[PDB]
Design a protein around this ligand. Structure first.
Ligand SMILES: *[C@@H]1O[C@H](CO)[C@@H](O[C@@H]2O[C@H](CO)[C@@H](O[C@@H]3O[C@H](CO[C@H]4O[C@H](CO)[C@@H](O)[C@H](O)[C@@H]4O)[C@@H](O)[C@H](O[C@H]4O[C@H](CO)[C@@H](O)[C@H](O)[C@@H]4O[C@H]4O[C@H](CO)[C@@H](O)[C@H](O)[C@@H]4O)[C@@H]3O)[C@H](O)[C@H]2NC(C)=O)[C@H](O)[C@H]1NC(C)=O
Ligand SMILES: *[C@@H]1O[C@H](CO)[C@@H](O[C@@H]2O[C@H](CO)[C@@H](O[C@@H]3O[C@H](CO[C@H]4O[C@H](CO)[C@@H](O)[C@H](O)[C@@H]4O)[C@@H](O)[C@H](O[C@H]4O[C@H](CO)[C@@H](O)[C@H](O)[C@@H]4O[C@H]4O[C@H](CO)[C@@H](O)[C@H](O)[C@@H]4O)[C@@H]3O)[C@H](O)[C@H]2NC(C)=O)[C@H](O)[C@H]1NC(C)=O
Ligand SMILES: *[C@@H]1O[C@H](CO)[C@@H](O[C@@H]2O[C@H](CO)[C@@H](O[C@@H]3O[C@H](CO[C@H]4O[C@H](CO)[C@@H](O)[C@H](O)[C@@H]4O)[C@@H](O)[C@H](O[C@H]4O[C@H](CO)[C@@H](O)[C@H](O)[C@@H]4O[C@H]4O[C@H](CO)[C@@H](O)[C@H](O)[C@@H]4O)[C@@H]3O)[C@H](O)[C@H]2NC(C)=O)[C@H](O)[C@H]1NC(C)=O
Ligand SMILES: *[C@@H]1O[C@H](CO)[C@@H](O[C@@H]2O[C@H](CO)[C@@H](O)[C@H](O)[C@H]2NC(C)=O)[C@H](O)[C@H]1NC(C)=O
Ligand SMILES: *[C@@H]1O[C@H](CO)[C@@H](O[C@@H]2O[C@H](CO)[C@@H](O)[C@H](O)[C@H]2NC(C)=O)[C@H](O)[C@H]1NC(C)=O
Ligand SMILES: *[C@@H]1O[C@H](CO)[C@@H](O[C@@H]2O[C@H](CO)[C@@H](O)[C@H](O)[C@H]2NC(C)=O)[C@H](O)[C@H]1NC(C)=O
Ligand SMILES: *[C@@H]1O[C@H](CO)[C@@H](O)[C@H](O)[C@H]1NC(C)=O
Lengths: 450, 126, 126, 126, 450, 450
């Protein structure tokens, strides 16, 4: 009849908590190829045959918006960029007045500039005039007559050139908990990012995640299994970003077609700077190519999905970005070490009523980079000789709704971004971190002796 | 059949009383980056040390589960044994008794100390 | 009434035998600066581990206080029980038996090993 | 006579069953350089913690050696007791039973859990 | 009849030991204001409602002279100064010959110098002449005609300028033990620093201690509760310093009255140096103000206390410091980021037989600082525009006795210092560090079974 | 009759494993003398009266060729060199064209060069011509007329000068395991380096090992107790090095006899470079001296030992090194901070059939050092005034066999090296690292209760 307290150790019970985790790269990343930005010696080899355990009859409330290990991901990727940035060459002497002239490009007007400037020689008391090729975006005029120019970051900070051996290829990264912690994965294929998840599993490490840096589009990410997924912290709040997850990728082919040449210039003792020499052949603008019918079907699918979460008899307009800096207004991404800034007006140039051609868009190239919207920390991109082609997969979209006055029966969406944390949020939506509390209490008819 | 990590979490607690060992072995399993791995390993080991000391202070060190002499209070739960051990999961049970974890714990330390000093006094005259 | 950390230090040892638990819970409680916090936490945890192993090697692991089978030697102290347990503090008692801590300790390990191997030999024929 | 660290390694295992304590006390004894000393101390302490937990999970925590209820299988070794305990060293014995360490271990956890839950069920009706 | 060994765990017994501790700052120090020299991200938030436990019937022998966590305090404050010193600007190019002229100061003679010098421009191959205002103390003549000058530390080391966002305000710091250690506090209000203390308490953390850097005087420290306290390791040894603790503070108001102007000069890329421009208005010497009657009553009190520890029929003379460097001979302290060196001859200008006026003293300003008496590590102080006023509390004194030949019935005392460790010793006198030894042995009639 | 499993804790059983260890220096190394390259604050004081425990009736298979804690020794000594290298002065401005002239050396031809060059003064915009003394090896000609010269590493890297307080004296280093690990020492005096060892002991720490950097010879090492020991991973494989261990040392006296002068030149702010001034007295080549009869008896002993491991009726030729860089072809070592490169043709100039004079050899001095065969990391050696004498002990030899076509009844050996790991292998041959596995299982007639 009487009952007694019984202490239980190892109970399968968890609680919500915030903690730090550790990285793990694949073993094949250690077979040479250490000359990569995300190549980390601290990332342990990935555990072979990882264990994913399905927790039947378990319901958990996921929420990826106030989720942890997203700010931690941002801090880790920033620290990795900075640690790769430290051992390379800082371009202090390159803040020198440049005589820049337009490129005739005879057998991209004003985009190419031939700039001559004085560089310090092997003797610190001597200077030599030398030329280089530069873009219009990464240079600014000193005056109004368009003769004297200076670097954009000259009165801001000092650029650090990327070391040429280091490669900007994203690599998969597994996030693993320490002892006493666990990662829960939502196996529900129609999960919208927040709320209960009927099918739950547990893993020691997440799947390999490539840290792809992009805006207005998501590249080389995961894909939804069943249907297009709309994720928002508050759909009626237009100030919050909207993440669109596709069930099928869209092939994107971005090509820099010109033939470059790399010139190594001795700036100081042990300091070599790589400049752009004369272009072999014709000069043409870089571009990206998208199948017209695939993109049209994609837009119709996402329009039909967006009809559900809004009034049905509401027309939907797609428009380009309103304005701002070039980093947000255009699709900025990495392609073979060269950073592309591609105009995206064509893909958002259609409105839908309530009832083998290829779209080709222009792209520009910048060499002075301020990534994660940082001020005072800038990167110089060395050129790559020859031509560059990158074929990738469109697997996600980032959209922003504008504030409509009352109910005008119209809602417009423009491509947004700016927060790279959202770039990790579309891949970490299904994962959450829990803390084990193995101690437990239960009443039982068992009584201890004396 | 073998059950993995946390595999009996959705199970009833009577069936889940057979798979404590997997959580037991999982509980310790394993410049700046070195600092973080080091600190989090230190965090895991001192969490395990605190849990093991809390088990030891109740006279239940070295045992997977252990009985005590605290009588169960109906104010914590008036539920029957059968519904607890054949229908009731560990998650919502922890949610229920989360109000009285501290009271049950302090009663545990107090009963252990009193019984053990009673044993000391009993053997003192022996 | 609750007594805090080290509150029974000036008390007689008989009254101070009721407040061991506070010291027990206090014993683990918690780039270059990170290195020092890390090392001192490591120092605290391995000190606790060494103390717990020294308790385990005397057959007294997991218990707050524990009796053994070493007979008390009058050469260490010829004092009566009543004066020790009703007038004598722990501080000056440690000062008194500081000469024989090591001898008492080695007698403890030796008695534990001998009794436990006697138990092994006794159960060997069972 | 006192025997030092690993002094009975070449001895027969029957004589070597008298000098476990020296290995027991040796098992925990003790910017970039600071990182390596720190990590290796952490490695030693969590190795000791894992060993102590493996001892605890067999119902043998806090004891130097401990008997269990697993019957010995002749498939592991058909050797007599006298040759094992008067002619056989620990090194080549570990070499012999290295094939069945895991099977013997799992039988140990399973027997401990079964006996202990049988004790729980027996005291449940008490 | 027979007795047995009984092992006790958790015994309240401690022993004297030396160990390291950790810092803890208040939570309100984390509400912005990270731009402080002692602002430390490693200092954990202070534990709310700290537990002080009175240990009745406990007597312990405190001794603050050979006490630990005083050299540790010095090492911590030195490391904090150096860590704040690293990320700022080093003034390598400022070691250049200066043409310095005297200041007319028409509608402090030779104290102000207008110095013109060549500074490197935005181009490394160009130099521009520019002027600045400097003091007489922080400059030295190159020659005997008084025309060419150089910085004092030019042939010693290279100065590092303090970053202007960083503030020199002292903040309270709590010192906390790790597990297995304790801090004992002597609650005896008449404790002289050494010997037994009847009233003892234990704390996890000490009270908040502001690391005030001063000599010949103690600022913003704790106060004695009952009477004036004289602390000395050996009173008959004149070579040891004497610490005087007052039961009531003395208000001190130190003012730099002139109106300054700060000029930001681009030295190199990303390097800005802040110089003193022309003084708005009249030029007047800085000064500190002390109430005459309060200081007289203070001196009479400390004389009456010093009568006890010496022969009664012995006259006592107060004299200024004999000589040495300016850091020890004058009261050097921090006031609004500007470092003051104030002449203290007036306060020690009285002798006492065995039987609304305000004292105002001059002050000078130095910008080249060698603190903790370090050689090769120097600090440049940026100026602060406008005027500066600091009101503080005199709560302690540092005195040194001179060697009198035999018994001349006279003992003279002069203000001393030099060792900043003593500055932490007047606030850490009541605190000591002990190590717990929880294992214990006791004979009892209890016997274990077989 | 029935038996039961019994668990044993603390069993004396070990297994082969690879792990990291820690360093320990003697306490007398902490009595000042911190100005040493291998002086390490992390190396704990050596445990007084270390315990060596003989493990009777124990046989273990040592193998020093694939042994661990040898690559770890190399990494530790490289990291110690780099850590001593960081806080000193880097010679960036010394890459300047030098006008070098030959030394007449009137009352070593072309070995001494008087080089005049422009050095930056206290003003960065001014240069002054100054002279220095340099060797022929550490300078290279810019052109073919032999007038303009440059430093050897000028187009490779930047040298870092050793700080003059730091001393290159080797000190003993003890290697100690953490808890749960052990070091086994082979006490067999005739042990050849691999295979079983009958007499085994265990130690917490190894004996003190001086990290002597040398090639073709081993200096100040341990000595064999009984006979000359030949150690090889594969004797028939000529591509593997051969280590010869002597039972008696050979006294070697190496002297730089010239009288030097050190000139301190202010290069930059806080930067002082030490150059060689005029030589006082005559100029003579450095040399090392070896007793002729002792070396002859040594060569006869090692020839007789080498007869055993080869066909008996095979003549053995000793020859100098075939060729390569100066670091391997000559005996390179440290002597009073000056690095000697001594020709070793005389000691290997004898062939042996199957049936008070002193050998004196020339030496050269290099100041630009590339040690551990590293490229891009170079060291400048400051000169030492006066003369230098080092007396050391020859305790080991490094030999390499050449590939003979079939059985020509002749085998030739030349002095080799290049791998400093072998230098640690001749002192770590007897030590191995094992991991304790204290858990054990045994069948016993004891049964637990219920
Ligand atoms: C989404 O995912 C897609 C699919 O992976 C990806 O497209 C591919 O990107 C990779 C990585 O940028 C491209 O591979 C590069 O291609 C060229 C040359 O390789 C070509 O030729 C070889 C030989 O046939 C083929 O195997 C290869 O597939 C290509 O056709 C080079 O730029 C790169 O090689 C360098 O990097 C490698 C790193 O693994 C090294 O192994 C290699 O040795 C090269 O390094 C050398 O050069 C570097 C530059 O100077 C230097 O840093 C190094 O030190 C060293 O000197 C690389 O192989 C591939 O072509 C793309 N595929 C297509 C169809 O376009 C998308 O980029 C990705 N999207 C996003 C946004 O991340
Ligand atoms: C013993 O203790 C006493 C009592 O606390 C102390 O006297 C006081 O010292 C403080 C600290 O130096 C003085 O406060 C400073 O005063 C001025 C301006 O503040 C006045 O005005 C405001 C507005 O009414 C009042 O709240 C305030 O009390 C003052 O009247 C400034 O120099 C300082 O402000 C800067 O520092 C603050 C740090 O907390 C920041 O919050 C603030 O934003 C300012 O920072 C800005 O300027 C800095 C300088 O350029 C720069 O580094 C920052 O990045 C930022 O741009 C500060 O508030 C106070 O006036 C003193 N009181 C009296 C009566 O004189 C003694 O100094 C102390 N003695 C010793 C030896 O330590
Ligand atoms: C194998 O082992 C042998 C035997 O030990 C060894 O030979 C000896 O080497 C040592 C170390 O190089 C030599 O000692 C040096 O000698 C001179 C002057 O010392 C002489 O005079 C004193 C006084 O009578 C005697 O005690 C001494 O034995 C010598 O006769 C100096 O070059 C060295 O002194 C400096 O270093 C010491 C480090 O311990 C300091 O204590 C000392 O103050 C000196 O430092 C000062 O000068 C340094 C140079 O500028 C500077 O760096 C410092 O900051 C400071 O200003 C040292 O005592 C000894 O003479 C050798 N013995 C013989 C017979 O030749 C072999 O070298 C060794 N072989 C190898 C390959 O390692
Ligand atoms: C960019 O400008 C530079 C001038 O700095 C041009 O380089 C010159 O080319 C001519 C024609 O071959 C040579 O005679 C000169 O000696 C070159 N000068 C230097 C400094 O190299 C360069 O050709 C221009 N680029 C293009 C595409 O016209
Ligand atoms: C300190 O000296 C400088 C000279 O370097 C004075 O600055 C000059 O002031 C006059 C009068 O207004 C101007 O014409 C010059 O152009 C200034 N020169 C520079 C370089 O700025 C400055 O006035 C002097 N300070 C005082 C208080 O007289
Ligand atoms: C090495 O060359 C320098 C020249 O740079 C010689 O130094 C000169 O010596 C003469 C004779 O005493 C002096 O008049 C000059 O003033 C010296 N010049 C400098 C720059 O110091 C030096 O003597 C030469 N060394 C030898 C051994 O002849
Ligand atoms: C200093 O003078 C300036 C002149 O612009 C004035 O604005 C400022 O208030 C003055 N400051 C003080 C502290 O008098």
């Amino acid at each position: 009849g009487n009952l007694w307290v019984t202490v239980y150790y190892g109970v399968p019970v968890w609680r919500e908590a915030e903690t730090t985790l550790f990285c793990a790269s694949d073993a094949k990343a250690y077979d040479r190829e250490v000359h990569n930005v995300w190549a980390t010696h601290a990332c342990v080899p990935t555990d072979p045959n990882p264990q994913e355990i399905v927790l039947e009859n378990v319901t958990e409330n996921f929420n990826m918006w106030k989720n942890d290990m997203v700010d931690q991901m941002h801090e880790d990727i920033i620290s990795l960029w900075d640690q790769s940035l430290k051992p390379c060459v800082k371009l202090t002497p390159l803040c020198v007045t440049l005589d820049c002239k337009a490129f005739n490009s005879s057998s991209a007007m004003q985009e190419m500039k031939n700039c001559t400037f004085n560089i310090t020689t092997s003797v610190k008391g001597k200077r030599q005039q030398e030329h280089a090729l530069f873009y219009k975006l990464d240079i600014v005029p000193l005056n109004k007559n368009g003769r004297q120019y200076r670097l954009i970051n000259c009165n801001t900070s000092t650029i650090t050139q990327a070391c040429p051996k280091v490669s900007f290829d994203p690599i998969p990264i597994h996030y693993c908990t320490p002892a006493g912690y666990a990662i829960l994965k939502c196996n529900n294929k129609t999960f919208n990012g927040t709320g209960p998840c009927n099918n739950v599993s547990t893993v020691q490490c997440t799947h390999g995640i490539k840290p792809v840096v992009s805006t207005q589009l998501l590249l080389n990410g995961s894909l939804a299994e069943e249907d297009i997924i709309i994720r928002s912290e508050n759909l009626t709040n237009n100030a919050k970003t909207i993440i669109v997850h596709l069930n099928e990728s869209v092939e994107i082919v971005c090509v820099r077609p010109n033939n470059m040449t790399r010139k190594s210039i001795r700036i100081g003792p042990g300091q070599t700077f790589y400049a752009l020499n004369e272009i072999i052949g014709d000069i043409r603008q870089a571009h990206c190519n998208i199948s017209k019918e695939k993109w049209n079907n994609t837009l119709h699918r996402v329009w039909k999905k967006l009809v559900e979460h809004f009034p049905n008899k509401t027309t939907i307009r797609f428009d380009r970005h309103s304005g701002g800096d070039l980093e947000i207004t255009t699709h900025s991404f990495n392609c073979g070490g060269e950073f592309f800034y591609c105009n995206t007006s064509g893909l958002f140039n259609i409105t839908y009523n309530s009832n083998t051609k290829v779209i080709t868009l222009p792209c520009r190239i910048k060499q002075i980079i301020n990534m994660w919207q940082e001020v005072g920390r800038a990167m110089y991109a060395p050129p790559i000789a020859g031509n560059i082609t990158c074929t990738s997969n469109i697997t996600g979209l980032l959209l922003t709704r504008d504030g409509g006055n009352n109910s005008t029966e119209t809602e417009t969406f423009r491509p947004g971004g700016g927060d790279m944390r959202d770039n990790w949020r579309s891949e970490l939506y299904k994962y959450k971190v829990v803390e084990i509390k193995p101690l437990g209490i239960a009443p039982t008819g068992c009584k201890r002796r004396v | 059949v073998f059950l993995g990590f946390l595999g009996a979490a959705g199970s009833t607690m009577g069936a889940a009383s057979n798979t404590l060992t997997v959580q037991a072995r999982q509980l310790l399993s394993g410049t700046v980056w070195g600092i973080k791995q080091l600190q989090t390993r230190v965090l895991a080991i001192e969490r395990y040390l605190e849990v093991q000391q809390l088990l030891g202070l109740w006279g239940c060190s070295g045992k997977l589960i252990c009985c005590t002499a605290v009588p169960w209070n109906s104010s914590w739960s008036n539920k029957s044994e059968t519904e607890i051990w054949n229908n009731m999961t560990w998650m919502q049970w922890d949610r229920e008794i989360s109000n009285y974890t501290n009271t049950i714990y302090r009663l545990l330390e107090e009963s252990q100390f009193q019984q053990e000093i009673n044993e000391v006094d009993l053997l003192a005259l022996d």
